[PDB]
């Protein structure tokens, strides 16, 4: 048996290779980005946004974030999904974004995911899996985003209930807001300190 290749930080220029456009580099015709909504994509459109803060409370302006989620009916656009249900054919389920160099705000345009089966017959509440990479971060940090309007589902979620500190569960709940017709969920991440976001070893 082999050992996993060891992780190393993405470093401060993680944009050159993962988001060449943010670095002002035009090498690829088709570029990956933060928009998971195609014209025929099913489901309710939502905007997910926030900032990532370091231990002194300052936003990281060099952070790279990716998300992975299921479609509107709770099915992943992956050959590894074994639900036997058809996935929305116009949905990649993944996106990548970087924080704005001046402000530190990041965002994604996506769809609110449907509930996905949990282990042993359980049901997980709607959630988006998120990973953070940056200079100073030696291994990508995994976390999940739940939704504050899914109170009943969250109360029964297996992963949220496996966090013994009830007070820490709240760091994983994004707040719904409604900016001019659009539904926005605010999710700020605190890497270290008071109200530190729960991070998972998955």
């Amino acid at each position: 048996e082999l050992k996993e290749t060891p992780s190393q930080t993405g470093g401060p220029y993680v944009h050159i290779g993962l988001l060449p456009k943010q670095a002002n580099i035009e090498v690829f015709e088709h570029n990956l980005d933060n928009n998971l909504v195609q014209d025929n994509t099913q489901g309710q459109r939502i905007r997910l946004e926030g900032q990532v803060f370091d231990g002194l409370g300052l936003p990281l302006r060099d952070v790279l974030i990716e998300i992975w989620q299921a479609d509107t009916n709770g099915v992943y656009p992956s050959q590894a999904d074994t639900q036997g249900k058809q996935v929305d054919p116009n949905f990649l389920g993944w996106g990548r974004t970087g924080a704005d160099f001046g402000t530190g705000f990041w965002s994604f345009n996506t769809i609110k995911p449907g509930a996905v089966p949990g282990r042993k017959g359980s049901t997980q509440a709607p959630h988006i899996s998120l990973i953070i990479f940056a200079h100073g971060i030696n291994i990508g940090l995994h976390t999940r985003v739940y939704f504050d309007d899914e109170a009943e589902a969250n109360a029964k979620d297996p992963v949220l209930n496996s966090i013994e500190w009830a007070t820490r569960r709240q760091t994983l709940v994004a707040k719904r807001e409604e900016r001019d017709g659009e539904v926005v969920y605010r999710f700020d991440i605190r890497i270290q300190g008071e109200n530190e976001t729960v991070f998972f070893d998955i």
Partner: protein, 238 residues
């Protein structure tokens, strides 16, 4: 064959989050321990990227940004295999790379190093592994990069890489180095990895029989991702 969860990540084979010698980690590392969870469909699934959307020079860093001529620097081919911990090939995984130019200069707004910029080099590429888990790309060997950790810190020559493969749990970003580089022994970033054998797993080896005469040298570098276990009794994943 019914697949179960990925094997647990062996935290002792990776750098810790808090590593004082790499100063930026001091304020960007969680104080709380990570919370381990049992895997669900969310962790064992991952996106699929289509070969059709890749350009012909996406894995050719020598030419994908060349405008008036060729970039200046050492022509090198890098290839290898991507497999999981049980030795199975990782097929159609998305491999992305990025690096500095021959001067050790990044084409990034925030890089003010005096090493000269090369108008014919971009520094990023991508490719999908084939059915055998094989990948190959061509580039210019990057120069070592001075940075501010201690005032005279220098990164060994290196190339950053990222893999998105079959399961979200395999998601990985790292960096590989070149056999023989003396700065490998002094780098605080490489030293965040606790064991010697793991630091060596990031060094690409000179592959002399694969050099192309009067053209390019060649380095061999293989990558290992987490592997899934098979289930033969209860299937609790769902």
């Amino acid at each position: 064959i019914i697949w179960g969860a990925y094997a647990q990540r062996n935290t002792e084979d990776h750098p810790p989050a808090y590593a004082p010698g790499y100063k930026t980690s001091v304020l960007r590392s969680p104080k709380n321990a990570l919370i381990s969870i049992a895997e669900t469909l969310s962790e064992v699934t991952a996106p699929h990227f289509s070969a059709d959307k890749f350009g012909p020079k996406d894995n050719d860093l020598i030419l994908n940004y060349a405008k008036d001529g060729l970039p200046i620097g050492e022509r090198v081919i890098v290839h290898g295999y991507v497999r999981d911990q049980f030795g199975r090939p990782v097929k159609n995984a998305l491999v992305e790379v990025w690096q500095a130019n021959a001067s050790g200069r990044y084409r990034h707004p925030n890089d003010q190093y005096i090493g000269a910029m090369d108008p014919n080099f971009g520094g990023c590429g991508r490719m999908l592994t084939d059915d055998n888990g094989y990948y190959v790309f061509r580039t210019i060997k990057p120069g070592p990069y001075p940075w501010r950790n201690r005032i005279n810190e220098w990164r060994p020559a290196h190339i950053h890489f990222s893999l998105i493969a079959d399961g979200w749990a395999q998601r990985l970003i790292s960096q590989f180095y070149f056999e023989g580089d003396t700065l490998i022994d002094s780098c605080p970033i490489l030293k965040t990895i606790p064991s010697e054998q793991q630091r060596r797993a990031l060094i690409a080896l000179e592959d002399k029989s694969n050099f192309i005469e009067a053209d390019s040298r060649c380095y061999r570098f293989d990558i290992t991702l987490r592997g899934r276990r098979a289930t033969y009794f209860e299937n609790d994943l769902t």
